[PDB]
Design a protein around this ligand. Structure first.
Ligand SMILES: CC(C)(C)C(=O)CSc1ncc2c(n1)-c1ccsc1CC2
Length: 150
């Protein structure tokens, strides 16, 4: 069977794929209470159990998907877990391309890392990340907006 590998980017921020998000035991052992689903078609796992607060970001893994519009909605959702001492799991699909894009944006926003330093930070903890030239460009546009105060 699949062994869940919830990569801890920060002690309260976890990242994974669709298979990593279906493991209920590890999520409770890691004290997560917030889940971010960055897909349009995947179900909110363990919704019928009333254990987590869910937020879905309806995004596709295409060359036209806009992920910048969902950054601030996810940052406040991650910050609401930070302020109450609980963990957050953000996940999408196999390549973890979408969910790692927001995590890099979060490390870029609240830790003041450069896009490469933030990318090298997440790449060292989860070595398998599918490339997406669209999301790379949106992260580059996001970095210069951070360097100019927006
Ligand atoms: C969408 C996402 C960023 C998660 C991705 O597509 C991972 S793949 C990749 N491979 C080589 C580089 C980079 N990303 C990168 C990222 C930012 S600056 C840079 C320069 C080398």
């Amino acid at each position: 069977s699949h062994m869940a590998e919830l990569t801890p980017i920060l002690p309260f921020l976890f990242l994974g794929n669709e298979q990593d998000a279906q493991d209920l035991d590890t999520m409770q052992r890691l004290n997560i209470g917030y889940v971010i689903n960055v897909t349009t078609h995947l179900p909110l796992y363990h919704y019928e159990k009333g254990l987590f607060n869910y937020k879905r970001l309806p995004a596709t893994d295409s060359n036209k998907q806009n992920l910048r519009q969902y950054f601030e909605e996810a940052f406040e959702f991650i910050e609401e877990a930070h302020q109450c001492g609980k963990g957050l799991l953000i996940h999408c699909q196999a390549g973890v391309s979408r969910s790692a894009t927001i995590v890099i944006a979060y490390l870029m926003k609240h830790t003041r890392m450069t896009m490469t330093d933030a990318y090298k930070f997440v790449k060292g903890k989860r070595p398998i990340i599918s490339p997406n030239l669209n999301f790379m460009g949106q992260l580059l546009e996001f970095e210069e907006d951070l360097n100019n105060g927006v």
